[PDB]
Design a protein around this ligand. Structure first.
Ligand SMILES: N#C/C=C/c1cc(Cl)cc(Oc2ccccc2OCCn2ccc(=O)[nH]c2=O)c1
Lengths: 538, 405
């Protein structure tokens, strides 16, 4: 016998305040009992388990489905605590790639000896006329909380020296599998695979498909990668669970297929939670999903990563707060794709959303390729310049170039830094009665121009915006507007190009029509002239 | 040479904090550095039995192209037992902020000579991440004292005292303070003599940043001096004065508002009356005094607010309760930061934190005028400091922006 190298165990304790599990053994049938007896017998012969006595009050329940099923749930609660999938696009193309999944994984790794007392279980004898047979685990049990971590740690420990000795190959270690790859000739590669599995055999790790590989919902071909086929359910009644499943699937599909839109479907899930409900769809949603099946008509593939070439990301605005991106190296060959949906705001603009998307793509890139890509953005250098220089918040985007592929991102209006000479000065005000919801909004100017509009079903903020809107409507191409409202100024200083308040949107449109707008603020009630609280308070 | 027992606060477990994505170069630098540190017994690899984790990344200090390892100990620091020693809670050396010049040094090399409590080591666990999760991350734990932990200088206080004992008795006029990995040394001397003294001190360390607190500013609130006043001018004035009235009690804007009466064009010149000029004068006199009843409470949190003024300039305020400011300041500094807002902001946060460390002996909690995601994405690239401040994000534009300009 060639002595196998010992795998040093991992010291394991339980949670403080809790003792080992004690649970009764459920009554089984006779066939189950015999099957379990046979299994445990041969397993004991293999050295993966050992029989115990009465000295072990801890008992974990067991079943049979033959295959043995041990339920560690309670032990999983009382066991201590232990320490994302790789993305195909990040994988660097190699000439040869071998997949080795170690068989009888957990059972090949010994268990902490002092912890073995807690893994005990009982096989009920026939008609309970005899003491139930007692066993305990000498190795890592299938279904234990601490098995995967200990297994992968041991595997890493073993694998380390082979890697350093073979720098000309690259080894990935995921869970129960190893994926080796090299640019070596298939002969040398096969040889080194043999050396590797021998090296694993020294520690007693038993190892055994071929491209393409179906792995984690993907498909890996030698020169390209994709996703496993997406099942699209079709029904006249669309439930909430259907929408969750479909959102998940579409999201999964959008890492490669460009142009996927989940917005309309995600809107249907707001405040629902009812697992069965029949929800009709808007025409926008129907055309959306039709274009989704249209995108899913002829499949396309992603390529692998080459460290020497640059990493490039290009973003397009899809409208309705939706953004789409493609990450590639050479033209028309994508490493991966994706999308960005806007955060839930009150008011917003395109530049902000674009920035957010850039940040997202940057983080994802740093995860996958470990670096920030060069960006191609549908925004002019001058636009970005003006924006970031005049923005009250600090903002930055990494290295990028302008690509002209409409719709472009632009600034729709720009407020003046200083009051405009020869431009009429509109002093505006608005107010409401919080009881009757009645209010007024209007303006007075230096040319004597005045207006006051009465309003029903409104509030102070609404009237304070309304006044500004009126000032915008009734004024020429250049206007100075004075307001006492910190709210309105707070909104306009955020520079939205779109809002969920129609009033605000109307204001925005008015601003767009203007050549020059100077918005000035003054304290209310302090008796500032031109600011008239009396006109709106009658 | 002997480990002093260290535990956590009652009812608190070790920090479990997600490691954020790192760029390839930083990962490599961390790998090399940690290999070297492993060979020196400063850290040792660990197994799955250690669920605890603390974030780690890599930086570059001033005037150096060599990478440095930076652990983020914030969660561990707050979970670390409040450290009181035989020092009896040493009061801050408030003669430090009064000094002519102050030099900051990195003493972190020393912390690696002292062993750490064996039970506590499991809490220092960190992870070097791998690109695209292709291999499990490399996990270490500290043997010696880690830089960045609040317990490290606390434990090393005695050693540091025994080391700096000759220097302090030699020239008592030189103030010495210690915060984290950094050692601050004040003097009234000349910059050359200062630097020579610093060489003397560092060589005195071997055998075992230049600031200017006197040149630091406490900013008064000022009003414009004009021959002619437009409607807009007076309106802004009334705004700033009304704002300041929240702080200074005696501020009254009524006679200035009396000038604005009627509807006039923003650009129309309005002559000041006698009552108005008198009011403005009284306001000026009021603003020239300090603030009434302003004190620093060590049992309270320090808040720092930063406003972006544009053209590379930034303003800030350190306070405890609103409208009562312990300090205010302005940062125009231009070094290679012209085209980058976030780099500027980062260096500003560093400056303010440093000043705060000098004055109160502790760092403030910043309120940053930046989106969470942008900051979180880019802040580690520009960060040269060994400690880290806490921060939050203000996403609503302040109206007071131009009132500090
Ligand atoms: N089941 C299963 C397999 C899954 C699997 C998972 C990972 Cl994380 C990596 C992997 O293959 C690689 C292993 C080592 C280095 C590079 C590799 O890939 C580089 C790209 N590539 C992919 C497939 C192919 O045939 N050729 C090829 O060059 C395979």
């Amino acid at each position: 016998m060639v002595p196998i190298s010992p795998i040093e165990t991992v010291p394991v304790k339980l949670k403080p305040g809790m003792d080992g599990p004690k649970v009764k053994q459920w009554p089984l049938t006779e066939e189950k009992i015999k099957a379990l007896v046979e299994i445990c017998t041969e397993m004991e012969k293999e050295g993966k388990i050992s029989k115990i006595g009465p000295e072990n009050p801890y008992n974990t329940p067991v079943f049979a489905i033959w295959r043995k099923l041990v339920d560690f749930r309670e032990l999983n609660k009382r066991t201590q605590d232990f320490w994302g999938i790789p993305h195909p696009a990040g994988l660097k193309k190699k000439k040869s790639v071998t997949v080795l999944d170690v068989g009888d994984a957990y059972f090949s790794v010994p268990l902490d000896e002092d912890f073995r007392k807690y893994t005990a279980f009982t096989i009920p004898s026939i008609n309970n006329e005899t003491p139930g047979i007692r066993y305990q685990y000498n190795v890592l049990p299938q279904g234990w909380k601490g098995s995967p971590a200990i297994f992968q740690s041991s595997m890493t420990k073993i694998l380390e020296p082979f890697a350093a000795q073979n720098p000309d190959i690259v080894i990935c270690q995921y869970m129960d599998d190893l994926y080796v790859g090299s640019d070596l000739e298939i002969g040398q590669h096969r040889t080194k695979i043999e050396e590797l599995r021998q090296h694993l055999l020294r520690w007693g790790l038993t190892t055994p498909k071929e491209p393409p590989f179906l792995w984690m919902g993907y498909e890996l071909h030698p020169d390209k990668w994709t996703v496993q086929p997406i099942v699209l359910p079709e029904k006249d009644s669309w439930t909430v669970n259907d929408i969750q499943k479909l959102v998940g699937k579409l999201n999964w599909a959008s890492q490669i297929y460009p142009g996927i839109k989940v917005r309309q479907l995600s809107k249907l899930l707001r405040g629902t939670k009812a697992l069965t409900e029949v929800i009709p769809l808007t025409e926008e949603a129907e055309l959306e999903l039709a274009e989704n099946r249209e995108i899913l008509k002829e499949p396309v593939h992603g390529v692998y990563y080459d460290p020497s070439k640059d990493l490039i990301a290009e973003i397009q605005k899809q409208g309705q707060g939706q953004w789409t991106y493609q990450i590639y190296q050479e033209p028309f060959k994508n490493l991966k794709t994706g999308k960005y949906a806007r955060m839930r705001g009150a008011h917003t603009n395109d530049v902000k959303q674009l920035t957010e998307a850039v940040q997202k793509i940057t983080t994802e890139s740093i995860v996958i390729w470990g670096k920030t890509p060069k960006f191609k953005l549908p925004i002019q250098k001058e636009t970005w310049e003006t924006w970031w220089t005049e923005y009250w918040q600090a903002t930055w985007i990494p290295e990028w170039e302008f690509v002209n592929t409409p719709p472009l991102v632009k600034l729709w209006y720009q407020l003046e830094k200083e009051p405009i000479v020869g431009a009429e000065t509109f002093y505006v005000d608005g107010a409401a009665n919080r009881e009757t919801k009645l209010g007024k909004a209007g303006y007075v100017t230096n040319k004597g121009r005045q207006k006051v509009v009465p309003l029903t079903n409104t509030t102070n903020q609404k009237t304070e915006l309304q006044a500004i809107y009126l000032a915008l409507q009734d004024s020429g191409l250049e206007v100075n507007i004075v307001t006492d409202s910190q709210y309105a100024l707070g909104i306009i200083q955020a520079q939205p190009d779109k809002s969920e308040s129609e009033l605000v949107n109307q204001i925005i449109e008015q601003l767009i029509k203007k050549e020059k707008v100077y918005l000035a603020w003054v304290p209310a009630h302090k008796g500032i002239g031109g600011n008239e609280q009396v006109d709106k308070l009658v | 040479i002997e480990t002093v027992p260290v535990k956590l606060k009652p009812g608190m477990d070790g920090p479990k904090v997600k490691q954020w994505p790192l760029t390839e170069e930083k990962i490599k630098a961390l790998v090399e550095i940690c290999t070297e540190m492993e060979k020196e017994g400063k850290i040792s690899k660990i197994g799955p039995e250690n669920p605890y984790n603390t974030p780690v990344f890599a930086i570059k200090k001033k005037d150096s192209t060599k990478w440095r390892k930076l652990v983020d100990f914030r969660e561990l620091n707050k979970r670390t037992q409040d450290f009181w020693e035989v020092q009896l809670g040493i009061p801050h050396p408030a003669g430090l902020k009064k000094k002519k010049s102050v030099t900051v040094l990195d003493v972190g090399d020393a912390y690696f000579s002292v062993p750490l409590d064996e039970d506590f080591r499991k809490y220092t666990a960190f992870t070097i991440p791998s690109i695209n999760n292709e291999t499990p991350g490399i996990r270490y734990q500290y043997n010696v004292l880690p830089q960045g932990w609040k317990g490290s200088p606390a434990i090393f206080q005695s050693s540091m005292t025994k080391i700096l004992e000759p220097f302090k008795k030699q020239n008592p006029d030189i103030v010495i303070y210690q915060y984290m990995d950094d050692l601050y040394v004040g003097s009234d001397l000349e910059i050359g003599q200062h630097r020579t003294k610093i060489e003397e001190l560092r060589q005195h360390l071997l055998r075992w940043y230049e600031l200017h607190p006197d040149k630091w500013t406490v900013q008064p609130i000022v009003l414009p001096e004009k021959d002619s006043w437009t409607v807009n001018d007076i309106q802004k004035l009334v705004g700033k004065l009304n704002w300041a009235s929240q702080i200074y009690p005696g501020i009254k804007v009524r006679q200035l508002s009396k000038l604005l009466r009627g509807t006039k064009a923003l650009t129309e010149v309005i002559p000041l009356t006698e009552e108005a000029e008198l009011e403005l004068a009284e306001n000026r006199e009021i603003l020239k005094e300090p603030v009434h009843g302003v004190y620093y409470d060590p049992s309270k949190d320090l808040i720092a607010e930063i406003q972006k003024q544009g053209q590379g300039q930034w303003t800030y305020q350190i306070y405890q309760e609103p409208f009562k400011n312990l300090k205010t300041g302005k940062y125009a500094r231009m070094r290679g930061a012209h085209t980058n807002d976030v780099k500027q902001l980062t260096e500003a946060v560093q400056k303010i934190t440093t000043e705060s460390i000098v004055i109160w002996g502790k760092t403030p909690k910043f309120k940053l005028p930046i989106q969470k995601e942008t900051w979180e994405t880019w802040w580690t690239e520009y960060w040269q400091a060994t400690w880290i401040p806490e921060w939050e994000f203000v996403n609503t534009p302040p109206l007071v922006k131009l009132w500090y300009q």
